[PDB]
Amino acid sequence: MKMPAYEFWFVVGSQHLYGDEALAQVEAHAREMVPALQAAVGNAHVLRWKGVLKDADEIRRLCLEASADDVCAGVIAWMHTFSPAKMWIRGLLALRKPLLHLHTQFNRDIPWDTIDMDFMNLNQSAHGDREYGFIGARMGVARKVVVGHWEDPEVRERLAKWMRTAVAFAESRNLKVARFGDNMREVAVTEGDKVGAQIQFGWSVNGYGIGDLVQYIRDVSEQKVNELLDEYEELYDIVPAGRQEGPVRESIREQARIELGLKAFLQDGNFTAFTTTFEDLHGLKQLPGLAVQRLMQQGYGFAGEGDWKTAALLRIMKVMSTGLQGGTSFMEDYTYHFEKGNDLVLGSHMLEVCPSIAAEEKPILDVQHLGIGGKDDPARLVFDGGEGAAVNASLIDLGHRFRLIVNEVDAVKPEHDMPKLPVARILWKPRPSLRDSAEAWILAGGAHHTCFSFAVTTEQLQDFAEMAGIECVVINEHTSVSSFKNELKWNEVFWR
Amino acid sequence: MPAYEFWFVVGSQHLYGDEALAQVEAHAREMVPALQAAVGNAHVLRWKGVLKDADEIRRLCLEASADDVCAGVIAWMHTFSPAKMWIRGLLALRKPLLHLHTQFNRDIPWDTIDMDFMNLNQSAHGDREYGFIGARMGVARKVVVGHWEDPEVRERLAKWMRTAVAFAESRNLKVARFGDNMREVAVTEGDKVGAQIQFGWSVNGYGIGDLVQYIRDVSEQKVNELLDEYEELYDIVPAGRQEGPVRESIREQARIELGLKAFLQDGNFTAFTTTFEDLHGLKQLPGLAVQRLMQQGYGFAGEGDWKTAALLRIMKVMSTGLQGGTSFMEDYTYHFEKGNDLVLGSHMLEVCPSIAAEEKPILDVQHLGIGGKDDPARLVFDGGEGAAVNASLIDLGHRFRLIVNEVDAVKPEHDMPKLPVARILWKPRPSLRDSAEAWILAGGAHHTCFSFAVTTEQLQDFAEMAGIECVVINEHTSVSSFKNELKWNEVFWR
Amino acid sequence: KMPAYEFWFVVGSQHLYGDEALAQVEAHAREMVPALQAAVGNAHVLRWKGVLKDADEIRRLCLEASADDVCAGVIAWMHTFSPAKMWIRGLLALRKPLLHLHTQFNRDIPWDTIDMDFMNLNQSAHGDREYGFIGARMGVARKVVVGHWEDPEVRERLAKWMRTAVAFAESRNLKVARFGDNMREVAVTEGDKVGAQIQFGWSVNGYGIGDLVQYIRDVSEQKVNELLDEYEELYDIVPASIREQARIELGLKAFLQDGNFTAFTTTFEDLHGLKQLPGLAVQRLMQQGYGFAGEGDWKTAALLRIMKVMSTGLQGGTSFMEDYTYHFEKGNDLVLGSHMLEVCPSIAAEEKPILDVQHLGIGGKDDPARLVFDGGEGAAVNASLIDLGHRFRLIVNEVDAVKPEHDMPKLPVARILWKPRPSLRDSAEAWILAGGAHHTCFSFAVTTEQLQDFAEMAGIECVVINEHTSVSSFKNELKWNEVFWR
Ligand SMILES: [Mn+2]
Ligand SMILES: [Mn+2]
Ligand SMILES: [Mn+2]
């Protein structure tokens, strides 16, 4: 949603072979490129010019400082001239921030008429980037490679997506998840290795008793709550049997108290994701719902049944998208519709699903009965899901490693409204086809719990997997279950 | 603890006719009762017949896998038994296997040995065939070699049966956690599904609120008679012999014991964990309650450590019969002295009185800072002396490792009047510095299971059955060679 | 000429034991650091870098220690229980050597006054085990030193490790200049220079002999005369020229300083421009702490510089070596180490190094001037680093140098005699099996422990051949290591 200032260090590789007139000419070319790259597809993320690097020491220092400086979200290296890779070795080793090797070229076209030797010793990026690329593969460093002219619209989009990803990665690297209660009992995919997750992604995932959150809701001012119900009334379409001071209003007031208690707790521990479990709610009047839905809109990561993995992922996919319109939500594939041309999946968690995936209008604020958790009638936001190309991502623990499964799906506007369904919902046709998406998904072992996002590209999730050093398997338009099983087997071998 | 049998099974073939198979029956039917009497009638040794046919062998192995009462199978090839017959079987066999390489006759009847005797008591090469197929299929098997009357072989069978019963208890071990792991603690954390896959452990999180409910509706009658039992069993500090705020604190532990016992019996839980960071609804951190439940055979560990609580339950059921005693344990402080390098083991409150000296544990109630709660009632006592074993199970991410440290518990020559928690002193083998170094290199937890009763042979045999590395730190351990054993094991177990 | 290096002492704890107890830890550390600084001797330097209770504090500490080129190593000790997840983000980012000091402030248990507050302070015993775990779990390269902080055994290990970690910090920033290529058809001299830079950090760069021939001729004849003057005060030189070596010494010295080189290799198969194969020059430069090896052997040259830096402080002396000849005898079964010319005067006997000038067929150049001297005596170490293609292996053979029985009048080269453990036959067999080079680093001052600790920091197999080595066991260790390290 917001918070810490993140910049990206642009770096250019050269050598002392072509002397100082060439080092000035590359520095000139860079000092022009950087600000155009900034104000065009920037504003949000600062793009620092960290100089032309020729010295082994200079490179190694730069990398160390990039690792030390919390504000450096990533390094964007480009070899304008031939920069010998053995200088980058100790540097690339010590570089703990995500690196993008930008294989570009200052001049779009070749100036056929005037192409002296001095131009071949200056705009030679074509092979200075290849030399660098070799040390990249040799040292097996996880790097994004973007190729093309730097003014190119394709390249500026890839730089912009990559910078949003590397910010999501930096937020991940010190992500703080609070779990209220443990996993839903006997559930396997919601379980995981929390310490192994800190090794891989950095996630501090820490368990609090529900009594620790009750203590926070007991401390919430009735005034701040009352103001919040005012904001509800103005923002959402409360069931008419809920504006008069009824037990229904007091049930919406209780979610307001839970929202401001959660918000208070989360902010007091700098938590950006959390998890509630219905199997442990002792001291809550009702299951956190509208509160959780509002916090997710407010951009917090969340997942039910203690699912820290998909809650973390939700936060990561929310901060992956900040700028773009789409919206990102916690999701559970609940029911299929089988029709020849209209093969739908109805996704809608228990009751906690983020308004960011809602259509042009509505958010209706209902409060029907819930059986799960055995608590008071819990207030919720209900709303039809939007439409358009989307992404359904689960993160799972295979024991020895993590696997990110991503399903490209197309959200679809509901042709029929469903009056008795007292939870927000969204329909989607999964690529390549319901039958083959679900087959491949089950084969990959994807969780029941997913992160549904319009805004997050697949490229975005694959980049984040490359940085974080996990398999990222995708099931989309081109996915053949036959080939996909083989790709699962060969990845398993690669990643262990 | 359900009633557990071992299936004694003798391999042979049809080759030497049927009279020879009748003679093998004759030998077995003599051995199996004598073997029962040797190991004690605690764990039953069923005679499950002579297996010749590949179908018969498969059927036996399938039955032993399906039957929850079959804790283990003891195979012994009397005659050459062609191992391909056992293949289909060994794959389907899900219970621990002991390959008993024995022989009926102690000595060679030099005067009367004939072709008939040679194709009867040919177990010397019959087992070696069965040995091959074992190696070939990588089956988890205990190999016991010796005459079936040798005391060493009967000791190894008895211990192996206790371990195979402990493995059967592990395999459907239910653990209840009351609250999550101590926040920011790493070795406490683990893969609970990876555990269920390796060990079978049903490890499940319960809100503390679920437990307060059980305490809130516990009969005050039972509480008063239990507190009456406390005064009998323990030497209550005098301020707790009269009705005061002290003896009420002791009553509140007794409430926590009875509620816990109720909650654990209701869910067939054999082990459980607390955490001091989630007690909302408990008046005080379970102490005397947990200590007493631990004595009563329940597996326990604090700070949400299901791995050590499971290990404690398994390590207790490994001892059932023996009177040694097993406890949850933390290595708290060292004493450095040229000839008297000691380690003081304790917990916040929770250490089983089954390791206590024969002195009657003092039932005290001092202040405890941690968890920030009421003055908790706890048993205080000095640990016994003798050879003992400190075991920690850890998750390395991909797989588990059982670190065992042989130690020698020692009686404190200097009593400790102002330590309000029970404690035990031990000299760890081979020395404090070497043990500690080797332990830290192996990544062993602060939290351990201390047992007088459990052998290293039992924990190695358990790790064999569960298919986890078991690394041992004892007299023989050198830190040089230990670091290489860790390296070379890592590669094998990946 | 040695850059200053410090070690960042850090104590683990948590907030859990209130805030008074964190003052008690502060007090304990502030006492232990000075007494440990004085115990290891004002030579290493040992900063107290504060008590760590937060994950974000621990990450900060690691990141500064990696960034700061002055931090040679970090010494972590958990005074109380320090929940190990807080160290994870930090230990991932820590690129400097870690020693996990598993100690305790109190030697004895105060049996009388052991309150709950005491147990909530002197945890170490289980606070360190938690830390140990996360170390084993992340597979971080860590030394574990256990025992009380007043133990001589602990303070000795701390010193030894600190020496090792400074040599390692000098390895990571090591620059080697090669004056010509390897000996054409030689195998054990060739290796992966990029693989070396990735494993150790060695910027090993080839120069032409023409570059050094340009540098040699531009030396002041005034400094040459002054260097000749120093020779006949330091060595009992034969009557006499030698100025060629003194010229080459100052021309190399100029080249090495100007490129910040601490190690270099010459080859005798490329000397187009040099009047004679550098001998006395290189022997002087090695004595001055430069890493060297002949026949373009950068691996041994790096290993020599690393083992010189590992020894600095002790008066042992480290040299370049080639196992030249054996002597077979009932008991006195010994080896004669030497090289063409290039042996370090730091391994000499009673001093009085002769400065002869005989002919050297090998170079095909002018009879070169050299230092000749008998090798000292005492327990020593013979280390070669080899490339197996996919990784490096440090082979270390413990030897006992022994002072020569007879004289060697006709031998125009510096030499040393040693009995290899556990015997010549076995030590050699183990050596050929481990594929050790002809070229070694012989040191009196370097311990096997040092080389094992260095290998653990550098992430390479370190195979050891000592008294306890058995050739059967050894072969098994080679196979099993092979599987672990690849
Ligand atoms: Mn769910
Ligand atoms: Mn503990
Ligand atoms: Mn040579």
Short mmCIF file of C-alpha atoms in Angstrom, two decimals, chain B residues 182-189 276-277 303 307 330-336 342-344 346 348 367-368 370 378 394-397 401 412 414-421 425 432-433 435-437 439-446 483-484 487-488 490-491 494, chain C residues 14 16-17 55 81-86 88 100 102-104 106-109 111-116 118-120 122-134 136-137 142-148 151 154 157 452-453 456 476-477 480-481 483-485:
data_model
loop_
_atom_site.label_atom_id
_atom_site.label_comp_id
_atom_site.label_asym_id
_atom_site.label_seq_id
_atom_site.Cartn_x
_atom_site.Cartn_y
_atom_site.Cartn_z
CA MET B 182 8.11 -19.40 21.54
CA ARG B 183 8.27 -16.39 19.13
CA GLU B 184 11.60 -16.05 17.21
CA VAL B 185 12.80 -19.59 18.33
CA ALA B 186 14.17 -21.77 15.50
CA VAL B 187 15.08 -25.32 16.78
CA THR B 188 11.55 -25.45 18.41
CA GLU B 189 10.05 -24.96 14.89
CA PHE B 276 4.57 -19.32 28.50
CA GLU B 277 3.78 -16.60 25.84
CA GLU B 303 7.89 -23.27 24.50
CA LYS B 307 9.41 -32.40 18.55
CA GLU B 330 17.30 -27.97 29.22
CA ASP B 331 21.13 -27.68 29.70
CA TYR B 332 20.98 -24.51 31.93
CA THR B 333 24.43 -23.81 33.51
CA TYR B 334 27.96 -25.34 33.47
CA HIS B 335 30.25 -25.84 36.50
CA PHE B 336 33.98 -25.70 35.43
CA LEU B 342 29.29 -30.49 35.59
CA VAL B 343 26.14 -29.42 33.68
CA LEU B 344 22.94 -28.39 35.54
CA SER B 346 16.41 -27.90 34.60
CA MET B 348 11.30 -23.09 34.14
CA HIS B 367 7.75 -16.61 42.10
CA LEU B 368 8.35 -17.17 38.35
CA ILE B 370 8.52 -15.75 32.71
CA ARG B 378 6.24 -26.99 41.26
CA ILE B 394 15.86 -31.49 15.18
CA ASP B 395 14.56 -30.67 11.65
CA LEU B 396 17.33 -29.73 9.16
CA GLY B 397 14.56 -28.72 6.69
CA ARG B 401 18.37 -35.83 12.89
CA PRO B 412 25.13 -32.89 44.07
CA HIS B 414 26.77 -29.20 47.52
CA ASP B 415 22.92 -28.84 48.02
CA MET B 416 21.22 -25.73 46.47
CA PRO B 417 18.82 -24.05 48.94
CA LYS B 418 17.72 -21.01 46.79
CA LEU B 419 17.01 -22.88 43.44
CA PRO B 420 13.18 -23.13 43.34
CA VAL B 421 13.15 -25.56 40.35
CA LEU B 425 23.75 -32.62 37.44
CA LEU B 432 31.89 -31.07 28.82
CA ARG B 433 33.90 -29.10 26.18
CA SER B 435 30.25 -32.96 24.13
CA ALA B 436 29.03 -29.31 23.95
CA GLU B 437 31.19 -28.64 20.79
CA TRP B 439 26.31 -31.08 20.19
CA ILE B 440 26.51 -27.48 18.76
CA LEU B 441 28.05 -28.85 15.51
CA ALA B 442 25.16 -31.42 15.25
CA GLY B 443 22.72 -28.51 15.87
CA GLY B 444 21.08 -30.21 18.88
CA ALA B 445 18.29 -28.25 20.65
CA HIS B 446 18.50 -26.50 24.05
CA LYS B 483 32.45 -33.38 12.06
CA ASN B 484 33.24 -35.76 9.13
CA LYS B 487 29.34 -34.32 6.59
CA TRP B 488 29.19 -37.94 5.22
CA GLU B 490 24.36 -35.43 5.30
CA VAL B 491 25.03 -36.84 1.78
CA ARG B 494 19.50 -36.28 1.48
CA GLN C 14 16.67 -11.42 24.42
CA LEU C 16 12.55 -11.79 27.98
CA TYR C 17 14.72 -11.62 31.21
CA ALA C 55 16.58 -9.47 14.64
CA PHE C 81 18.93 -17.58 25.30
CA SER C 82 18.86 -15.49 22.02
CA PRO C 83 15.98 -16.88 19.85
CA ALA C 84 17.84 -18.03 16.71
CA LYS C 85 15.23 -16.94 14.06
CA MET C 86 16.38 -13.32 14.90
CA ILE C 88 18.68 -15.91 10.40
CA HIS C 100 30.78 -19.36 17.95
CA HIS C 102 30.36 -21.32 23.67
CA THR C 103 31.45 -19.92 27.07
CA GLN C 104 30.01 -18.93 30.50
CA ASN C 106 30.99 -17.85 36.09
CA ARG C 107 33.54 -20.73 36.28
CA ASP C 108 31.74 -22.49 39.21
CA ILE C 109 28.01 -22.65 40.16
CA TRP C 111 25.60 -23.36 44.95
CA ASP C 112 24.36 -21.04 47.79
CA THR C 113 23.01 -18.03 45.78
CA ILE C 114 21.54 -19.68 42.57
CA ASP C 115 18.20 -17.77 42.39
CA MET C 116 15.77 -17.88 39.40
CA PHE C 118 20.84 -16.36 38.02
CA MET C 119 19.43 -19.13 35.74
CA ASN C 120 17.77 -16.26 33.67
CA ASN C 122 23.99 -17.59 32.57
CA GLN C 123 21.93 -19.64 29.96
CA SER C 124 24.80 -19.99 27.39
CA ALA C 125 24.69 -23.85 27.96
CA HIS C 126 21.31 -23.83 26.03
CA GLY C 127 21.34 -20.34 24.47
CA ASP C 128 24.44 -21.37 22.46
CA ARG C 129 22.84 -24.76 21.52
CA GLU C 130 19.84 -22.88 20.00
CA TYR C 131 22.37 -20.68 18.09
CA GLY C 132 24.40 -23.78 17.19
CA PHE C 133 21.24 -25.35 15.72
CA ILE C 134 20.46 -22.39 13.39
CA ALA C 136 23.91 -26.26 11.46
CA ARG C 137 20.46 -25.62 9.88
CA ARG C 142 31.44 -21.57 11.76
CA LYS C 143 34.26 -22.38 14.21
CA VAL C 144 32.93 -23.68 17.58
CA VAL C 145 35.26 -23.01 20.56
CA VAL C 146 33.91 -24.22 23.93
CA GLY C 147 35.18 -23.70 27.50
CA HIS C 148 35.43 -20.88 30.10
CA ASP C 151 40.75 -21.10 29.90
CA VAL C 154 40.12 -21.24 24.73
CA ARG C 157 42.17 -21.29 19.99
CA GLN C 452 41.52 -26.83 8.48
CA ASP C 453 39.82 -23.60 9.85
CA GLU C 456 36.19 -24.32 6.53
CA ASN C 476 37.85 -43.95 2.31
CA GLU C 477 37.96 -40.30 3.59
CA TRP C 480 33.46 -39.80 1.08
CA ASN C 481 34.75 -36.18 1.02
CA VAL C 483 30.85 -37.09 -2.57
CA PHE C 484 30.25 -34.39 0.11
CA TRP C 485 32.19 -31.57 -1.62
#
